[PDB]
């Protein structure tokens, strides 16, 4: 019950001392949105939800629900939904007379629902069979949280929510409101509870604690008269640390109780126990049944070890089987598991809250070092985000996030970056280029070695002998007038389809063979040539010629009613070059039209909105569903569906992009190759599950592309600009890119020091009584040092990390029993050098409140780390900032200001000690905002004349704060530990003595996450004003911004009209979800607008869109699309 460690647990989310014990021991307009969805796993189940012959895995994040189908290769995604609440219970069950299972869900605000998966055609819905709210007016929530269980015969549902009460929900075909009733329990402290198998009336078994140890007991539930009757067997005694109850299935029956160094089996009178030595070291957390009999079980530790529990049975000579013994075997090591589930055929899913989750295989024969476990996949988890910083290493106008993530063995550093990343190698400034093609200089040799530029009105054939550039045109091509395509198809030929003529050329003789010229002297507008044929179009008409060895043949010819804008050709499957289908785009009546290749026979047509002519179009194959993408001269990017057999009109919904028109042409990165679209921002359209990526590129701009696969440029692609050529190799595709650096120990704080080009990271590790546990970064440092002051264990270190290769340059080890709490890096006074300043405290087991600490000043030099000054202090050092040239530090309910003299010392200036436990500290100009432990906020000022502190204002209304930020000169933002956000403001009232010593809470919001850190910055290059990022315990990243008044009114009206139309999954009301909620109060939200709902307006259908804001549809599409580009 020492404060630093309990606060660290709160920072990671582990069960901490309840706040009540801590008590005993003693006019604004904002906009909030999400940039990265939560990633930690709270729960997970398996079953038959989608159909009767499917095996499903269902995963719960904080407010997300994900559904996967289990195949022989791994997992496949089918749906993902978001709920208006925090999921606390999730169970599958199947009533009699049902084809498949239904899902029960309970929310942390006590919303209950039953859901069913209904997939009819190609569309998928989640329908709500019943819904209600099960909250009690009077009572207090218990420890160990909420518990929910289901009878094996689907007769009732049992809930433990409060103390001294057991809530029962009957499960008959009536009860669409989930009416419940309470049964009184004599036992006021229940540890775990479950329903027993193979009984006649619903039987319940549970473990409780009271003076004289903890016990296990049973009951029978009579839902016909609302009372417990009596259990099948009496009450026993169990180990003082019994915590887990398992109900064994039918052939055995009975219960298995798990504690520490004991595993026990009770069934009526039968009783067995084992105490295998391996269980001593660490605690078992989770369990899962492998065999439907109940013949094997999996168990997982707090340190990552995975065990199998075996029940060996005895066949009776005439009676039912019994069991004789129990056995435990160490299987191996994984990540610490919050959820463990078993899938099928020796495959296990390990779901984690403090590390990456992963998919594992169990072998029958131990490999080297005797392990049965072999990893298969990992899924990234940003973990608890305990601290982060914004850094712009490469000196463009775009920053990156660097965060400390994870815990004990899973601790790491994460780098988060925006966009698609190319790595320019041959950078030369060439002005405007009209296009770009390859050319083959040899027979069909391996990767190409020649390229063709094309300028505003010209095409020039280069040569490429490696990294160098050279110009040497073979004397058979064009050099002064633009060609539409010059590439290759097959069979020892070259294409030259010019606006002057069409051609076939010899490559081995490098000579001309034959030519064909337009017999109208009228110049072509747009052509197309894919990989075996060319299709062209002139005036109002369209030719089509197949390219055959050594000559040309006319294969099709037909005029179009309107003037051709563009064409395309591509074989999309079992067709080796010849594409039976073809599409046409038009200027005047903007319309995509389907026309067969062989004879230009009419197939169909479809029109659109707008007037400006399109700039590009392609037919695209990425999945089993083909697409036709057109790109217009305004910024709209339209997509239509292709069924290559018939071609019935598939999905559509309008969109805008950047100001310049878009050019779309296909790239290569994987055998599931996708398309790239050139605009003001190059934009990949890639396949993720079935939808479209719209990710930008870390690039100024590009117009027209051509892939490059040469030996020195293995998977590159040359892109042209108004004045640039841009080439590089492709990283990931999605919007955010995450890079991981493993540390093998817990990080706590991070800070950046530019003039050194390094990071400083505080870290900690655990050591047995002290030798070793495993190699870590604090151990394998390049250099190392130990403190030499003269004024399990945890060992704290300061790590100096290189910013390029991300390796540990140096490690400093602090004194014994010393906890480093805060870190800063700055310049003080008139000294020119920049230091690393660290604040610590000395932590002892018996006593309850630290009473000493240091403030150490380090200088990192050419290759070493020195020490400059020490300044022992009488208390813990919770935070410090660099104020103006001085140092501001909070010492154990006091705030103090220090000065850096010419002797390289620090000297005290002034103090303020009215608060209690000042934890957080932020500064702006001459004001200081102090965030208290349980005393809301406090605003202070520094008076340069008298050189001391003056208390300007204080906020009443107790609040258990967890983070603090300064928005501008007058609005202060705070996050509290019940998952709420609030905004305070300085009251402008008369009577200048008393009511100006008040801050008014002018904004309230319920977020649903636990905020750990705020920081000023943004992730995009270069309506709204300001930008603050925050990070949470579940791994979510969010963004807060300020608005005007007219915009706030507009969007609030929009919010009401939107949630009058959208259907919520469990039929929860958005207004109820976002209300400010603590045990002491509940008020409607005000002063906040949430952008998740607003951004969902772009996913709605055209008729539903006009119902909202019934003042045009596009007039609001523009606004929302503008808002979408903030993050």
mmCIF file of N, CA and C in Angstrom, residues 485-538:
data_model
loop_
_atom_site.group_PDB
_atom_site.id
_atom_site.type_symbol
_atom_site.label_atom_id
_atom_site.label_comp_id
_atom_site.label_asym_id
_atom_site.label_seq_id
_atom_site.Cartn_x
_atom_site.Cartn_y
_atom_site.Cartn_z
ATOM 1 N N UNK A 485 1.154 4.605 -75.934
ATOM 2 C CA UNK A 485 1.673 3.360 -75.373
ATOM 3 C C UNK A 485 2.759 2.805 -76.291
ATOM 4 N N UNK A 486 3.855 2.315 -75.701
ATOM 5 C CA UNK A 486 5.038 1.912 -76.453
ATOM 6 C C UNK A 486 5.572 0.570 -75.951
ATOM 7 N N UNK A 487 4.826 -0.085 -75.066
ATOM 8 C CA UNK A 487 5.317 -1.224 -74.315
ATOM 9 C C UNK A 487 5.511 -2.490 -75.126
ATOM 10 N N UNK A 488 5.372 -3.618 -74.434
ATOM 11 C CA UNK A 488 5.568 -4.940 -75.010
ATOM 12 C C UNK A 488 4.385 -5.830 -74.657
ATOM 13 N N UNK A 489 4.128 -6.830 -75.501
ATOM 14 C CA UNK A 489 3.139 -7.842 -75.146
ATOM 15 C C UNK A 489 3.769 -9.236 -75.144
ATOM 16 N N UNK A 490 4.237 -9.707 -76.301
ATOM 17 C CA UNK A 490 4.775 -11.050 -76.485
ATOM 18 C C UNK A 490 5.182 -11.206 -77.942
ATOM 19 N N UNK A 491 5.928 -12.276 -78.221
ATOM 20 C CA UNK A 491 6.274 -12.701 -79.580
ATOM 21 C C UNK A 491 7.058 -11.618 -80.329
ATOM 22 N N UNK A 492 8.201 -11.266 -79.737
ATOM 23 C CA UNK A 492 9.314 -10.627 -80.449
ATOM 24 C C UNK A 492 8.841 -9.397 -81.229
ATOM 25 N N UNK A 493 8.057 -8.549 -80.566
ATOM 26 C CA UNK A 493 7.471 -7.381 -81.204
ATOM 27 C C UNK A 493 7.451 -6.195 -80.245
ATOM 28 N N UNK A 494 7.338 -4.999 -80.824
ATOM 29 C CA UNK A 494 7.175 -3.757 -80.080
ATOM 30 C C UNK A 494 5.913 -3.052 -80.558
ATOM 31 N N UNK A 495 5.236 -2.363 -79.639
ATOM 32 C CA UNK A 495 4.047 -1.581 -79.960
ATOM 33 C C UNK A 495 4.438 -0.121 -80.120
ATOM 34 N N UNK A 496 3.877 0.520 -81.147
ATOM 35 C CA UNK A 496 3.934 1.977 -81.256
ATOM 36 C C UNK A 496 2.552 2.432 -81.723
ATOM 37 N N UNK A 497 1.695 2.781 -80.770
ATOM 38 C CA UNK A 497 0.351 3.269 -81.052
ATOM 39 C C UNK A 497 0.358 4.770 -80.792
ATOM 40 N N UNK A 498 0.647 5.524 -81.841
ATOM 41 C CA UNK A 498 0.865 6.956 -81.778
ATOM 42 C C UNK A 498 -0.405 7.679 -82.214
ATOM 43 N N UNK A 499 -0.505 8.958 -81.852
ATOM 44 C CA UNK A 499 -1.530 9.786 -82.471
ATOM 45 C C UNK A 499 -1.277 9.994 -83.957
ATOM 46 N N UNK A 500 -0.065 9.708 -84.433
ATOM 47 C CA UNK A 500 0.267 9.799 -85.848
ATOM 48 C C UNK A 500 -0.071 8.510 -86.590
ATOM 49 N N UNK A 501 0.264 7.360 -86.007
ATOM 50 C CA UNK A 501 0.014 6.072 -86.642
ATOM 51 C C UNK A 501 0.027 4.982 -85.581
ATOM 52 N N UNK A 502 -0.268 3.760 -86.017
ATOM 53 C CA UNK A 502 -0.071 2.567 -85.204
ATOM 54 C C UNK A 502 0.889 1.654 -85.952
ATOM 55 N N UNK A 503 1.642 0.861 -85.200
ATOM 56 C CA UNK A 503 2.888 0.287 -85.677
ATOM 57 C C UNK A 503 3.128 -1.075 -85.041
ATOM 58 N N UNK A 504 3.951 -1.875 -85.713
ATOM 59 C CA UNK A 504 4.618 -3.013 -85.099
ATOM 60 C C UNK A 504 6.053 -3.006 -85.600
ATOM 61 N N UNK A 505 7.003 -3.199 -84.687
ATOM 62 C CA UNK A 505 8.419 -3.025 -84.980
ATOM 63 C C UNK A 505 9.150 -4.321 -84.658
ATOM 64 N N UNK A 506 10.296 -4.511 -85.304
ATOM 65 C CA UNK A 506 11.179 -5.614 -84.976
ATOM 66 C C UNK A 506 12.151 -5.208 -83.874
ATOM 67 N N UNK A 507 12.436 -6.151 -82.976
ATOM 68 C CA UNK A 507 13.368 -5.930 -81.875
ATOM 69 C C UNK A 507 14.741 -6.530 -82.151
ATOM 70 N N UNK A 508 14.797 -7.804 -82.535
ATOM 71 C CA UNK A 508 16.074 -8.393 -82.927
ATOM 72 C C UNK A 508 16.687 -7.690 -84.133
ATOM 73 N N UNK A 509 15.952 -7.402 -85.216
ATOM 74 C CA UNK A 509 16.514 -6.551 -86.274
ATOM 75 C C UNK A 509 16.461 -5.059 -85.979
ATOM 76 N N UNK A 510 15.725 -4.633 -84.947
ATOM 77 C CA UNK A 510 15.611 -3.219 -84.573
ATOM 78 C C UNK A 510 15.107 -2.369 -85.738
ATOM 79 N N UNK A 511 14.323 -2.983 -86.620
ATOM 80 C CA UNK A 511 13.910 -2.364 -87.871
ATOM 81 C C UNK A 511 12.389 -2.341 -87.957
ATOM 82 N N UNK A 512 11.882 -1.571 -88.916
ATOM 83 C CA UNK A 512 10.452 -1.479 -89.164
ATOM 84 C C UNK A 512 10.027 -2.631 -90.068
ATOM 85 N N UNK A 513 8.788 -3.097 -89.887
ATOM 86 C CA UNK A 513 8.196 -4.127 -90.730
ATOM 87 C C UNK A 513 6.964 -3.615 -91.470
ATOM 88 N N UNK A 514 6.054 -2.949 -90.761
ATOM 89 C CA UNK A 514 4.798 -2.502 -91.347
ATOM 90 C C UNK A 514 4.169 -1.469 -90.428
ATOM 91 N N UNK A 515 3.328 -0.619 -91.013
ATOM 92 C CA UNK A 515 2.650 0.424 -90.261
ATOM 93 C C UNK A 515 1.201 0.526 -90.715
ATOM 94 N N UNK A 516 0.374 1.101 -89.845
ATOM 95 C CA UNK A 516 -1.016 1.393 -90.160
ATOM 96 C C UNK A 516 -1.304 2.811 -89.691
ATOM 97 N N UNK A 517 -1.986 3.577 -90.535
ATOM 98 C CA UNK A 517 -2.249 4.984 -90.279
ATOM 99 C C UNK A 517 -3.748 5.226 -90.281
ATOM 100 N N UNK A 518 -4.178 6.189 -89.471
ATOM 101 C CA UNK A 518 -5.595 6.523 -89.397
ATOM 102 C C UNK A 518 -6.040 7.065 -90.747
ATOM 103 N N UNK A 519 -6.970 6.404 -91.439
ATOM 104 C CA UNK A 519 -7.337 6.856 -92.786
ATOM 105 C C UNK A 519 -8.375 7.966 -92.758
ATOM 106 N N UNK A 520 -8.209 8.912 -91.837
ATOM 107 C CA UNK A 520 -9.050 10.098 -91.788
ATOM 108 C C UNK A 520 -8.270 11.365 -91.485
ATOM 109 N N UNK A 521 -6.959 11.273 -91.254
ATOM 110 C CA UNK A 521 -6.119 12.399 -90.856
ATOM 111 C C UNK A 521 -6.617 13.066 -89.577
ATOM 112 N N UNK A 522 -7.466 12.374 -88.821
ATOM 113 C CA UNK A 522 -8.013 12.880 -87.569
ATOM 114 C C UNK A 522 -7.325 12.171 -86.408
ATOM 115 N N UNK A 523 -6.852 12.952 -85.441
ATOM 116 C CA UNK A 523 -5.927 12.447 -84.435
ATOM 117 C C UNK A 523 -6.649 11.761 -83.279
ATOM 118 N N UNK A 524 -6.058 10.659 -82.808
ATOM 119 C CA UNK A 524 -6.651 9.887 -81.725
ATOM 120 C C UNK A 524 -6.658 10.708 -80.436
ATOM 121 N N UNK A 525 -7.624 10.414 -79.564
ATOM 122 C CA UNK A 525 -7.725 11.059 -78.260
ATOM 123 C C UNK A 525 -7.189 10.173 -77.140
ATOM 124 N N UNK A 526 -7.749 8.974 -76.982
ATOM 125 C CA UNK A 526 -7.363 8.045 -75.925
ATOM 126 C C UNK A 526 -7.338 6.631 -76.493
ATOM 127 N N UNK A 527 -6.316 5.866 -76.116
ATOM 128 C CA UNK A 527 -6.128 4.483 -76.536
ATOM 129 C C UNK A 527 -6.040 3.581 -75.304
ATOM 130 N N UNK A 528 -5.715 2.309 -75.534
ATOM 131 C CA UNK A 528 -5.524 1.360 -74.446
ATOM 132 C C UNK A 528 -4.830 0.117 -74.987
ATOM 133 N N UNK A 529 -3.903 -0.422 -74.199
ATOM 134 C CA UNK A 529 -3.107 -1.577 -74.602
ATOM 135 C C UNK A 529 -2.663 -2.290 -73.334
ATOM 136 N N UNK A 530 -3.158 -3.512 -73.115
ATOM 137 C CA UNK A 530 -2.982 -4.136 -71.808
ATOM 138 C C UNK A 530 -1.783 -5.073 -71.697
ATOM 139 N N UNK A 531 -1.862 -6.255 -72.301
ATOM 140 C CA UNK A 531 -0.687 -7.106 -72.426
ATOM 141 C C UNK A 531 -0.696 -7.989 -73.664
ATOM 142 N N UNK A 532 -1.734 -7.950 -74.505
ATOM 143 C CA UNK A 532 -1.665 -8.649 -75.782
ATOM 144 C C UNK A 532 -2.390 -7.949 -76.925
ATOM 145 N N UNK A 533 -3.101 -6.844 -76.691
ATOM 146 C CA UNK A 533 -3.847 -6.193 -77.762
ATOM 147 C C UNK A 533 -4.003 -4.710 -77.448
ATOM 148 N N UNK A 534 -4.401 -3.953 -78.468
ATOM 149 C CA UNK A 534 -4.617 -2.513 -78.367
ATOM 150 C C UNK A 534 -6.050 -2.181 -78.775
ATOM 151 N N UNK A 535 -6.704 -1.321 -77.992
ATOM 152 C CA UNK A 535 -8.022 -0.783 -78.321
ATOM 153 C C UNK A 535 -7.946 0.742 -78.275
ATOM 154 N N UNK A 536 -8.365 1.393 -79.358
ATOM 155 C CA UNK A 536 -8.217 2.834 -79.513
ATOM 156 C C UNK A 536 -9.582 3.454 -79.814
ATOM 157 N N UNK A 537 -9.624 4.789 -79.812
ATOM 158 C CA UNK A 537 -10.859 5.523 -80.061
ATOM 159 C C UNK A 537 -10.540 6.924 -80.566
ATOM 160 N N UNK A 538 -11.215 7.344 -81.638
ATOM 161 C CA UNK A 538 -10.964 8.636 -82.267
ATOM 162 C C UNK A 538 -12.294 9.318 -82.567
#
